[PDB]
Amino acid sequence: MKASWRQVFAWRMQRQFLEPRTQPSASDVVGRLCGVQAQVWSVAELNVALRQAAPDRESVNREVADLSLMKTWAMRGTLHLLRPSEAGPYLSLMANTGSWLKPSWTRASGVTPRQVDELTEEVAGILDGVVLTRDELVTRLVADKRFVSMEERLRSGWGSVLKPLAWRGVLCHGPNRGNKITFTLPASQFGADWGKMPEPDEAAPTVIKAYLGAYGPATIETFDRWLSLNSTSKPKLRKWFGDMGDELTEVDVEGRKAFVLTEHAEELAATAPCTGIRLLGGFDQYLLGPGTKDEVVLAPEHRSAVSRAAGWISPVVVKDGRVVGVWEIVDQELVVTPFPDTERLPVKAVEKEAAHVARASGVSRLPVRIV
């Protein structure tokens, strides 16, 4: 079949609870979006709240509190919100990349593959039904003879060393102790909601299904870029997609051959081309799904305005499905900065979005300035 990009954009925005507007729970949003980047917590709250007809940013904190959401390291090694019952397949595929097996990882971390296995085992035992800060956990570890020589390596580079453990499912965030972050065992925290982790082969079709269900149609390259910055074996990827067979449909999207779920093929073909304005927070999944690199969404000459140093992903103005500018809250005003070659933004449409963002931010009003 054929489809236009504006069809695809409209369909994606329907799947991602952007247009039309409904009132999904935080778990519904996180589940649908295949996770939400949560390194900056305020940004994760906003991106869920903006996907609710009546923005409810505290829904994230509440559902984290009642343990219907987990925080751990997943895609591309970054901190994600995930539904605990859905986390398995995602994590299994990350472990499959075996990033920590590379000599370069060993040289940087100061931890051997043998030692990663030992840490996996020991951390799982320490955190079983136990909540510890980083320092508390590291202190427990170095009491061990296998790890006493590693104390310096573990403290300074904990952020890197913990990721294989997260991917293997032996650690995740516990409840915050005041302002400090804690770690615990997923199995003990989530109980019957924590399923046994699948092998990568059985997990792959689940992850691919979930991905295409929000960010389809897409290529294999685009999928693995989102998953792991293209770290997966390419022959393995070919088999994963191939074994799904007619569960997938090939779509010619204005020249680009891509895969969509067959169950969504007819729906996509009937979707009207994307129209309208949408104001998305920073690090939004609408962008990160297909990737900021995708030139049909974001023009290459304007990419540096969105994706900046230290991995900053700006809030974006989306018009007809394409990124046409950025925005920022300054002095409790919503300041919009369109790109030079961007069409004149209808002020009333922007102001309506600002009111939606205002509610999602927990403030009464956000005056608009277009710069």
mmCIF file of C-alpha atoms in Angstrom:
data_model
loop_
_atom_site.group_PDB
_atom_site.id
_atom_site.type_symbol
_atom_site.label_atom_id
_atom_site.label_comp_id
_atom_site.label_asym_id
_atom_site.label_seq_id
_atom_site.Cartn_x
_atom_site.Cartn_y
_atom_site.Cartn_z
ATOM 1 C CA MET A 1 0.000 0.000 0.000
ATOM 2 C CA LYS A 2 0.886 3.690 -0.243
ATOM 3 C CA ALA A 3 0.469 6.469 2.305
ATOM 4 C CA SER A 4 1.474 10.105 2.691
ATOM 5 C CA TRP A 5 3.585 11.344 5.591
ATOM 6 C CA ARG A 6 0.773 13.601 6.784
ATOM 7 C CA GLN A 7 -1.436 10.511 6.938
ATOM 8 C CA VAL A 8 1.255 8.790 9.008
ATOM 9 C CA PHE A 9 1.639 11.815 11.300
ATOM 10 C CA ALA A 10 -2.100 11.998 11.960
ATOM 11 C CA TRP A 11 -2.260 8.258 12.621
ATOM 12 C CA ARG A 12 0.720 8.388 14.988
ATOM 13 C CA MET A 13 -0.825 11.295 16.888
ATOM 14 C CA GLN A 14 -4.029 9.304 17.234
ATOM 15 C CA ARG A 15 -2.106 6.316 18.599
ATOM 16 C CA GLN A 16 -0.081 8.558 20.941
ATOM 17 C CA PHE A 17 -3.177 10.183 22.496
ATOM 18 C CA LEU A 18 -2.306 13.584 20.999
ATOM 19 C CA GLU A 19 -5.260 14.048 18.605
ATOM 20 C CA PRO A 20 -8.122 13.494 19.302
ATOM 21 C CA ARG A 21 -8.029 14.103 23.052
ATOM 22 C CA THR A 22 -8.951 11.466 25.629
ATOM 23 C CA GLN A 23 -8.201 10.857 29.309
ATOM 24 C CA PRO A 24 -5.784 7.922 29.488
ATOM 25 C CA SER A 25 -4.144 7.022 32.791
ATOM 26 C CA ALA A 26 -0.406 7.608 33.178
ATOM 27 C CA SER A 27 0.035 3.841 32.780
ATOM 28 C CA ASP A 28 -1.980 3.918 29.543
ATOM 29 C CA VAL A 29 0.285 6.634 28.133
ATOM 30 C CA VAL A 30 3.574 5.061 29.244
ATOM 31 C CA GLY A 31 2.438 1.656 28.004
ATOM 32 C CA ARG A 32 1.284 2.979 24.636
ATOM 33 C CA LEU A 33 4.414 5.075 24.053
ATOM 34 C CA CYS A 34 6.786 2.159 24.775
ATOM 35 C CA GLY A 35 8.137 4.066 27.758
ATOM 36 C CA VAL A 36 8.722 7.734 28.512
ATOM 37 C CA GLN A 37 12.172 9.247 29.030
ATOM 38 C CA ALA A 38 12.315 10.305 32.668
ATOM 39 C CA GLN A 39 15.837 11.564 33.325
ATOM 40 C CA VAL A 40 14.294 14.997 33.813
ATOM 41 C CA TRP A 41 11.263 14.161 35.943
ATOM 42 C CA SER A 42 9.328 17.391 35.373
ATOM 43 C CA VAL A 43 9.533 16.731 31.636
ATOM 44 C CA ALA A 44 8.179 13.179 31.991
ATOM 45 C CA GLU A 45 5.229 14.489 34.010
ATOM 46 C CA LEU A 46 4.448 17.100 31.362
ATOM 47 C CA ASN A 47 4.495 14.691 28.420
ATOM 48 C CA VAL A 48 1.940 12.441 30.102
ATOM 49 C CA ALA A 49 -0.214 15.386 31.212
ATOM 50 C CA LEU A 50 -0.274 16.932 27.736
ATOM 51 C CA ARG A 51 -1.748 13.649 26.472
ATOM 52 C CA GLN A 52 -4.779 14.058 28.744
ATOM 53 C CA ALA A 53 -7.833 16.105 27.723
ATOM 54 C CA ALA A 54 -7.882 17.350 31.302
ATOM 55 C CA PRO A 55 -4.132 17.524 32.142
ATOM 56 C CA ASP A 56 -3.345 15.657 35.357
ATOM 57 C CA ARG A 57 0.413 15.824 35.885
ATOM 58 C CA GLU A 58 0.211 14.326 39.380
ATOM 59 C CA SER A 59 -1.173 11.126 37.838
ATOM 60 C CA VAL A 60 2.425 10.073 37.165
ATOM 61 C CA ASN A 61 3.551 10.522 40.779
ATOM 62 C CA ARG A 62 0.421 8.739 42.043
ATOM 63 C CA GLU A 63 0.880 5.751 39.740
ATOM 64 C CA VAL A 64 4.577 5.572 40.633
ATOM 65 C CA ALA A 65 3.502 5.615 44.283
ATOM 66 C CA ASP A 66 0.957 2.785 43.925
ATOM 67 C CA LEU A 67 3.588 0.870 41.932
ATOM 68 C CA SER A 68 1.713 0.722 38.623
ATOM 69 C CA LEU A 69 4.763 2.410 37.061
ATOM 70 C CA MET A 70 8.479 1.682 37.416
ATOM 71 C CA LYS A 71 11.593 3.751 36.773
ATOM 72 C CA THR A 72 14.634 2.023 35.317
ATOM 73 C CA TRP A 73 17.197 2.156 32.519
ATOM 74 C CA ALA A 74 15.943 0.774 29.215
ATOM 75 C CA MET A 75 16.219 1.986 25.597
ATOM 76 C CA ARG A 76 19.591 3.498 24.671
ATOM 77 C CA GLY A 77 20.550 3.047 28.325
ATOM 78 C CA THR A 78 18.479 6.052 29.420
ATOM 79 C CA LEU A 79 16.112 6.233 32.390
ATOM 80 C CA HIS A 80 12.545 5.354 31.366
ATOM 81 C CA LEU A 81 9.121 5.093 32.916
ATOM 82 C CA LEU A 82 7.670 1.659 32.111
ATOM 83 C CA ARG A 83 4.705 -0.490 33.079
ATOM 84 C CA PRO A 84 6.235 -3.215 35.284
ATOM 85 C CA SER A 85 4.185 -5.962 33.594
ATOM 86 C CA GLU A 86 5.460 -4.830 30.176
ATOM 87 C CA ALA A 87 9.090 -4.116 31.082
ATOM 88 C CA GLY A 88 10.403 -7.646 30.513
ATOM 89 C CA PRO A 89 10.544 -7.769 26.691
ATOM 90 C CA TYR A 90 12.119 -4.291 26.459
ATOM 91 C CA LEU A 91 14.812 -5.101 29.019
ATOM 92 C CA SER A 92 15.583 -8.500 27.476
ATOM 93 C CA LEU A 93 16.336 -6.848 24.136
ATOM 94 C CA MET A 94 18.658 -4.328 25.801
ATOM 95 C CA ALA A 95 20.571 -7.102 27.577
ATOM 96 C CA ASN A 96 20.875 -8.819 24.194
ATOM 97 C CA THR A 97 23.019 -5.935 22.889
ATOM 98 C CA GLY A 98 25.765 -7.021 25.294
ATOM 99 C CA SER A 99 27.203 -3.506 25.319
ATOM 100 C CA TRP A 100 29.185 -4.182 28.490
ATOM 101 C CA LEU A 101 31.011 -7.059 26.785
ATOM 102 C CA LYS A 102 32.891 -4.686 24.487
ATOM 103 C CA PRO A 103 36.559 -3.981 25.360
ATOM 104 C CA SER A 104 35.802 -0.239 25.206
ATOM 105 C CA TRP A 105 33.173 -0.616 27.956
ATOM 106 C CA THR A 106 35.584 -2.609 30.125
ATOM 107 C CA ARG A 107 38.329 0.002 29.699
ATOM 108 C CA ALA A 108 36.010 2.871 30.622
ATOM 109 C CA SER A 109 34.132 1.227 33.510
ATOM 110 C CA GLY A 110 36.945 -0.746 35.135
ATOM 111 C CA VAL A 111 34.626 -3.750 35.463
ATOM 112 C CA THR A 112 35.108 -7.045 33.621
ATOM 113 C CA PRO A 113 32.271 -9.147 32.128
ATOM 114 C CA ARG A 114 32.918 -11.783 34.801
ATOM 115 C CA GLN A 115 32.515 -9.089 37.442
ATOM 116 C CA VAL A 116 29.299 -7.784 35.866
ATOM 117 C CA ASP A 117 27.815 -11.268 36.301
ATOM 118 C CA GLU A 118 28.968 -11.396 39.923
ATOM 119 C CA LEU A 119 27.444 -7.972 40.562
ATOM 120 C CA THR A 120 24.188 -9.030 38.915
ATOM 121 C CA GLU A 121 23.880 -11.972 41.308
ATOM 122 C CA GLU A 122 24.910 -10.103 44.438
ATOM 123 C CA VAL A 123 22.840 -6.967 43.808
ATOM 124 C CA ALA A 124 19.772 -9.146 43.229
ATOM 125 C CA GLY A 125 20.263 -10.718 46.657
ATOM 126 C CA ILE A 126 20.988 -7.469 48.476
ATOM 127 C CA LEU A 127 17.969 -5.638 47.039
ATOM 128 C CA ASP A 128 15.429 -8.452 47.454
ATOM 129 C CA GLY A 129 12.719 -6.741 49.503
ATOM 130 C CA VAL A 130 15.211 -4.036 50.452
ATOM 131 C CA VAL A 131 15.487 -0.357 49.498
ATOM 132 C CA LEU A 132 18.935 1.281 49.418
ATOM 133 C CA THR A 133 20.545 4.488 48.207
ATOM 134 C CA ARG A 134 23.478 4.242 45.793
ATOM 135 C CA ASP A 135 25.991 4.744 48.599
ATOM 136 C CA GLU A 136 24.229 2.225 50.835
ATOM 137 C CA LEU A 137 24.208 -0.378 48.051
ATOM 138 C CA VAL A 138 27.847 0.225 47.103
ATOM 139 C CA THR A 139 28.805 -0.038 50.780
ATOM 140 C CA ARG A 140 27.100 -3.439 50.986
ATOM 141 C CA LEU A 141 28.915 -4.592 47.849
ATOM 142 C CA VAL A 142 32.444 -3.568 48.856
ATOM 143 C CA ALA A 143 32.001 -5.473 52.113
ATOM 144 C CA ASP A 144 32.318 -8.466 49.775
ATOM 145 C CA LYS A 145 35.785 -9.745 48.933
ATOM 146 C CA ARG A 146 35.087 -9.895 45.196
ATOM 147 C CA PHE A 147 34.298 -6.164 45.134
ATOM 148 C CA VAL A 148 36.410 -4.566 47.875
ATOM 149 C CA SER A 149 39.054 -3.599 45.311
ATOM 150 C CA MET A 150 36.411 -1.927 43.126
ATOM 151 C CA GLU A 151 35.104 0.658 45.593
ATOM 152 C CA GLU A 152 36.428 3.662 43.667
ATOM 153 C CA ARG A 153 35.296 2.306 40.290
ATOM 154 C CA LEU A 154 31.779 1.638 41.586
ATOM 155 C CA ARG A 155 31.079 5.030 43.175
ATOM 156 C CA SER A 156 32.405 7.279 40.405
ATOM 157 C CA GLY A 157 30.970 5.202 37.547
ATOM 158 C CA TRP A 158 27.821 3.737 39.104
ATOM 159 C CA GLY A 159 25.687 5.300 36.376
ATOM 160 C CA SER A 160 27.395 3.172 33.739
ATOM 161 C CA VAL A 161 27.819 -0.064 35.707
ATOM 162 C CA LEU A 162 24.188 -0.250 36.852
ATOM 163 C CA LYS A 163 22.780 -0.424 33.324
ATOM 164 C CA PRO A 164 23.525 -4.098 32.587
ATOM 165 C CA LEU A 165 21.935 -4.845 35.964
ATOM 166 C CA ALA A 166 18.862 -2.803 35.050
ATOM 167 C CA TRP A 167 18.652 -4.600 31.705
ATOM 168 C CA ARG A 168 18.900 -7.975 33.457
ATOM 169 C CA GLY A 169 16.069 -6.905 35.761
ATOM 170 C CA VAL A 170 17.876 -7.076 39.111
ATOM 171 C CA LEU A 171 17.490 -3.381 39.936
ATOM 172 C CA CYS A 172 15.169 -0.432 39.459
ATOM 173 C CA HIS A 173 14.225 2.715 41.366
ATOM 174 C CA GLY A 174 12.568 2.313 44.734
ATOM 175 C CA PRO A 175 10.538 5.086 46.346
ATOM 176 C CA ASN A 176 12.605 8.247 46.810
ATOM 177 C CA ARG A 177 13.902 8.742 50.337
ATOM 178 C CA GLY A 178 13.334 12.471 50.602
ATOM 179 C CA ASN A 179 15.371 13.851 47.704
ATOM 180 C CA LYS A 180 17.690 10.848 47.385
ATOM 181 C CA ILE A 181 17.199 8.096 44.806
ATOM 182 C CA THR A 182 16.900 4.493 46.000
ATOM 183 C CA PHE A 183 17.314 1.104 44.328
ATOM 184 C CA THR A 184 15.447 -2.171 44.802
ATOM 185 C CA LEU A 185 14.674 -5.541 43.191
ATOM 186 C CA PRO A 186 11.848 -5.383 40.592
ATOM 187 C CA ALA A 187 10.601 -8.836 41.627
ATOM 188 C CA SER A 188 10.130 -7.893 45.293
ATOM 189 C CA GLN A 189 8.643 -4.445 44.617
ATOM 190 C CA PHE A 190 6.110 -5.415 41.945
ATOM 191 C CA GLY A 191 5.263 -8.988 42.968
ATOM 192 C CA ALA A 192 2.700 -10.660 40.716
ATOM 193 C CA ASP A 193 3.033 -7.780 38.236
ATOM 194 C CA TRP A 194 6.644 -8.777 37.535
ATOM 195 C CA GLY A 195 6.710 -11.532 34.937
ATOM 196 C CA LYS A 196 9.674 -13.817 34.334
ATOM 197 C CA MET A 197 11.928 -12.277 31.715
ATOM 198 C CA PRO A 198 11.741 -13.688 28.169
ATOM 199 C CA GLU A 199 14.617 -14.613 25.873
ATOM 200 C CA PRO A 200 15.371 -12.017 23.168
ATOM 201 C CA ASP A 201 13.870 -14.074 20.308
ATOM 202 C CA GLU A 202 10.478 -14.374 22.020
ATOM 203 C CA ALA A 203 10.592 -10.772 23.253
ATOM 204 C CA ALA A 204 11.418 -9.152 19.910
ATOM 205 C CA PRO A 205 8.003 -9.456 18.236
ATOM 206 C CA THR A 206 6.350 -7.985 21.352
ATOM 207 C CA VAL A 207 8.665 -4.972 21.344
ATOM 208 C CA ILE A 208 8.380 -4.521 17.573
ATOM 209 C CA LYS A 209 4.579 -4.686 17.827
ATOM 210 C CA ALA A 210 4.530 -2.081 20.591
ATOM 211 C CA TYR A 211 6.941 0.179 18.707
ATOM 212 C CA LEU A 212 5.107 0.080 15.366
ATOM 213 C CA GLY A 213 1.822 0.584 17.204
ATOM 214 C CA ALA A 214 2.895 4.102 18.184
ATOM 215 C CA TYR A 215 5.618 5.134 15.725
ATOM 216 C CA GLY A 216 4.862 3.081 12.619
ATOM 217 C CA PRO A 217 5.361 2.769 9.780
ATOM 218 C CA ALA A 218 9.118 2.339 10.282
ATOM 219 C CA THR A 219 12.226 0.615 8.953
ATOM 220 C CA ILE A 220 14.403 -1.909 10.756
ATOM 221 C CA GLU A 221 17.138 0.730 11.002
ATOM 222 C CA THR A 222 14.783 3.248 12.592
ATOM 223 C CA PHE A 223 13.595 0.651 15.101
ATOM 224 C CA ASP A 224 17.081 -0.318 16.277
ATOM 225 C CA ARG A 225 18.124 3.342 16.378
ATOM 226 C CA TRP A 226 15.320 3.974 18.866
ATOM 227 C CA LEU A 227 16.091 0.739 20.713
ATOM 228 C CA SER A 228 19.870 0.869 21.037
ATOM 229 C CA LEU A 229 21.390 3.398 18.618
ATOM 230 C CA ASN A 230 21.794 0.540 16.129
ATOM 231 C CA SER A 231 23.687 -1.834 18.437
ATOM 232 C CA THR A 232 21.731 -5.000 17.590
ATOM 233 C CA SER A 233 23.035 -7.673 15.208
ATOM 234 C CA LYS A 234 21.641 -6.819 11.780
ATOM 235 C CA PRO A 235 21.141 -10.475 10.785
ATOM 236 C CA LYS A 236 19.249 -10.956 14.064
ATOM 237 C CA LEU A 237 16.999 -7.968 13.309
ATOM 238 C CA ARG A 238 16.248 -9.383 9.865
ATOM 239 C CA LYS A 239 15.074 -12.666 11.389
ATOM 240 C CA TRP A 240 12.962 -10.919 14.041
ATOM 241 C CA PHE A 241 11.035 -8.904 11.463
ATOM 242 C CA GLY A 242 11.000 -11.749 8.951
ATOM 243 C CA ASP A 243 9.564 -14.329 11.337
ATOM 244 C CA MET A 244 6.588 -12.063 11.987
ATOM 245 C CA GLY A 245 5.564 -12.589 8.356
ATOM 246 C CA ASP A 246 2.205 -11.174 7.290
ATOM 247 C CA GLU A 247 1.755 -9.679 10.762
ATOM 248 C CA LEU A 248 3.600 -6.817 9.051
ATOM 249 C CA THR A 249 2.632 -4.874 5.931
ATOM 250 C CA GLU A 250 5.066 -2.974 3.725
ATOM 251 C CA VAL A 251 4.141 0.675 3.174
ATOM 252 C CA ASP A 252 5.532 3.026 0.538
ATOM 253 C CA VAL A 253 5.507 6.347 2.394
ATOM 254 C CA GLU A 254 6.350 8.850 -0.350
ATOM 255 C CA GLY A 255 9.368 6.804 -1.429
ATOM 256 C CA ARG A 256 10.299 5.198 1.890
ATOM 257 C CA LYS A 257 9.598 1.482 2.204
ATOM 258 C CA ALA A 258 8.620 0.827 5.817
ATOM 259 C CA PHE A 259 6.741 -1.710 7.944
ATOM 260 C CA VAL A 260 3.366 -1.182 9.601
ATOM 261 C CA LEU A 261 1.346 -3.737 11.570
ATOM 262 C CA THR A 262 -1.148 -5.369 9.212
ATOM 263 C CA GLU A 263 -3.869 -4.866 11.833
ATOM 264 C CA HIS A 264 -3.352 -1.098 11.385
ATOM 265 C CA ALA A 265 -2.992 -1.000 7.586
ATOM 266 C CA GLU A 266 -6.627 -0.219 6.698
ATOM 267 C CA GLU A 267 -6.898 2.271 9.551
ATOM 268 C CA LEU A 268 -3.830 4.152 8.302
ATOM 269 C CA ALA A 269 -5.102 4.288 4.717
ATOM 270 C CA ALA A 270 -8.365 5.859 5.912
ATOM 271 C CA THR A 271 -6.692 8.466 8.140
ATOM 272 C CA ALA A 272 -7.026 12.052 6.920
ATOM 273 C CA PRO A 273 -3.788 14.065 6.438
ATOM 274 C CA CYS A 274 -2.485 15.705 9.616
ATOM 275 C CA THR A 275 -3.566 19.293 10.316
ATOM 276 C CA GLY A 276 -3.231 21.629 13.296
ATOM 277 C CA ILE A 277 -0.828 22.805 15.986
ATOM 278 C CA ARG A 278 0.540 20.840 18.926
ATOM 279 C CA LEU A 279 2.906 22.027 21.669
ATOM 280 C CA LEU A 280 4.970 19.156 23.043
ATOM 281 C CA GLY A 281 7.285 19.263 26.048
ATOM 282 C CA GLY A 282 10.985 18.476 25.883
ATOM 283 C CA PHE A 283 12.266 14.966 25.172
ATOM 284 C CA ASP A 284 8.852 14.005 23.811
ATOM 285 C CA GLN A 285 8.249 10.491 22.511
ATOM 286 C CA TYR A 286 6.586 11.876 19.370
ATOM 287 C CA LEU A 287 10.112 12.946 18.430
ATOM 288 C CA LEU A 288 12.208 10.231 20.050
ATOM 289 C CA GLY A 289 10.192 7.369 18.581
ATOM 290 C CA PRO A 290 11.139 8.003 14.937
ATOM 291 C CA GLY A 291 14.238 9.851 16.150
ATOM 292 C CA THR A 292 15.275 13.501 15.885
ATOM 293 C CA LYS A 293 17.346 12.410 12.874
ATOM 294 C CA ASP A 294 14.244 11.745 10.747
ATOM 295 C CA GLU A 295 14.298 14.499 8.128
ATOM 296 C CA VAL A 296 10.616 14.239 7.137
ATOM 297 C CA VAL A 297 9.675 15.410 10.644
ATOM 298 C CA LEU A 298 12.573 17.767 11.369
ATOM 299 C CA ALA A 299 14.547 19.540 8.644
ATOM 300 C CA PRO A 300 18.299 18.845 8.953
ATOM 301 C CA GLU A 301 19.235 22.539 8.868
ATOM 302 C CA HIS A 302 16.982 23.149 11.894
ATOM 303 C CA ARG A 303 18.073 20.092 13.885
ATOM 304 C CA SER A 304 20.635 21.909 16.046
ATOM 305 C CA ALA A 305 17.862 24.174 17.357
ATOM 306 C CA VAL A 306 16.041 21.124 18.749
ATOM 307 C CA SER A 307 18.770 18.609 19.611
ATOM 308 C CA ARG A 308 21.563 20.494 21.397
ATOM 309 C CA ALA A 309 24.650 19.704 23.513
ATOM 310 C CA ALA A 310 24.637 17.203 26.389
ATOM 311 C CA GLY A 311 21.602 15.589 24.755
ATOM 312 C CA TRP A 312 19.127 18.423 25.348
ATOM 313 C CA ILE A 313 15.926 17.838 23.363
ATOM 314 C CA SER A 314 13.903 21.056 23.270
ATOM 315 C CA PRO A 315 10.139 21.423 23.538
ATOM 316 C CA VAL A 316 8.784 21.631 19.983
ATOM 317 C CA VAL A 317 6.029 23.251 17.973
ATOM 318 C CA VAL A 318 4.426 20.624 15.745
ATOM 319 C CA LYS A 319 2.396 21.841 12.757
ATOM 320 C CA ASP A 320 0.692 19.320 10.471
ATOM 321 C CA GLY A 321 2.864 16.651 12.110
ATOM 322 C CA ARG A 322 6.206 18.359 11.415
ATOM 323 C CA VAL A 323 8.478 20.219 13.842
ATOM 324 C CA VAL A 324 8.399 23.900 12.841
ATOM 325 C CA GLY A 325 9.914 25.536 15.917
ATOM 326 C CA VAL A 326 10.715 25.343 19.628
ATOM 327 C CA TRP A 327 9.284 26.907 22.773
ATOM 328 C CA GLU A 328 10.200 27.657 26.361
ATOM 329 C CA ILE A 329 8.487 28.936 29.498
ATOM 330 C CA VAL A 330 10.135 32.242 30.432
ATOM 331 C CA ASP A 331 8.840 34.433 33.274
ATOM 332 C CA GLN A 332 5.712 32.254 33.217
ATOM 333 C CA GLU A 333 5.135 33.162 29.581
ATOM 334 C CA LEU A 334 5.140 30.643 26.735
ATOM 335 C CA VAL A 335 7.771 31.955 24.331
ATOM 336 C CA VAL A 336 7.517 30.424 20.857
ATOM 337 C CA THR A 337 10.488 30.605 18.484
ATOM 338 C CA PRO A 338 9.558 29.336 15.008
ATOM 339 C CA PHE A 339 12.249 28.443 12.489
ATOM 340 C CA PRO A 340 13.091 31.141 9.892
ATOM 341 C CA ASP A 341 11.233 29.453 7.011
ATOM 342 C CA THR A 342 8.206 28.443 9.094
ATOM 343 C CA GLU A 343 4.702 29.525 8.076
ATOM 344 C CA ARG A 344 2.908 32.154 10.176
ATOM 345 C CA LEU A 345 1.463 30.370 13.211
ATOM 346 C CA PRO A 346 -2.214 31.211 13.873
ATOM 347 C CA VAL A 347 -2.059 33.111 17.169
ATOM 348 C CA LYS A 348 -5.391 31.804 18.461
ATOM 349 C CA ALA A 349 -4.451 28.173 17.838
ATOM 350 C CA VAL A 350 -1.168 28.738 19.672
ATOM 351 C CA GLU A 351 -2.959 30.430 22.573
ATOM 352 C CA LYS A 352 -5.308 27.454 22.880
ATOM 353 C CA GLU A 353 -2.320 25.121 23.132
ATOM 354 C CA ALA A 354 -0.747 27.464 25.693
ATOM 355 C CA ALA A 355 -3.856 27.069 27.862
ATOM 356 C CA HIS A 356 -3.497 23.292 27.617
ATOM 357 C CA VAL A 357 0.187 23.552 28.556
ATOM 358 C CA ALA A 358 -0.714 25.919 31.398
ATOM 359 C CA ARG A 359 -3.084 23.358 32.910
ATOM 360 C CA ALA A 360 -0.466 20.634 32.431
ATOM 361 C CA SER A 361 2.015 22.880 34.279
ATOM 362 C CA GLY A 362 -0.335 23.613 37.178
ATOM 363 C CA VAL A 363 -0.655 27.332 36.470
ATOM 364 C CA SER A 364 -3.702 29.424 35.588
ATOM 365 C CA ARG A 365 -2.363 31.188 32.497
ATOM 366 C CA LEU A 366 0.551 31.296 30.082
ATOM 367 C CA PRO A 367 0.612 34.465 27.959
ATOM 368 C CA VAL A 368 2.092 33.829 24.505
ATOM 369 C CA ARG A 369 4.961 35.604 22.776
ATOM 370 C CA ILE A 370 5.985 34.581 19.257
ATOM 371 C CA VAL A 371 9.574 35.638 18.570
#
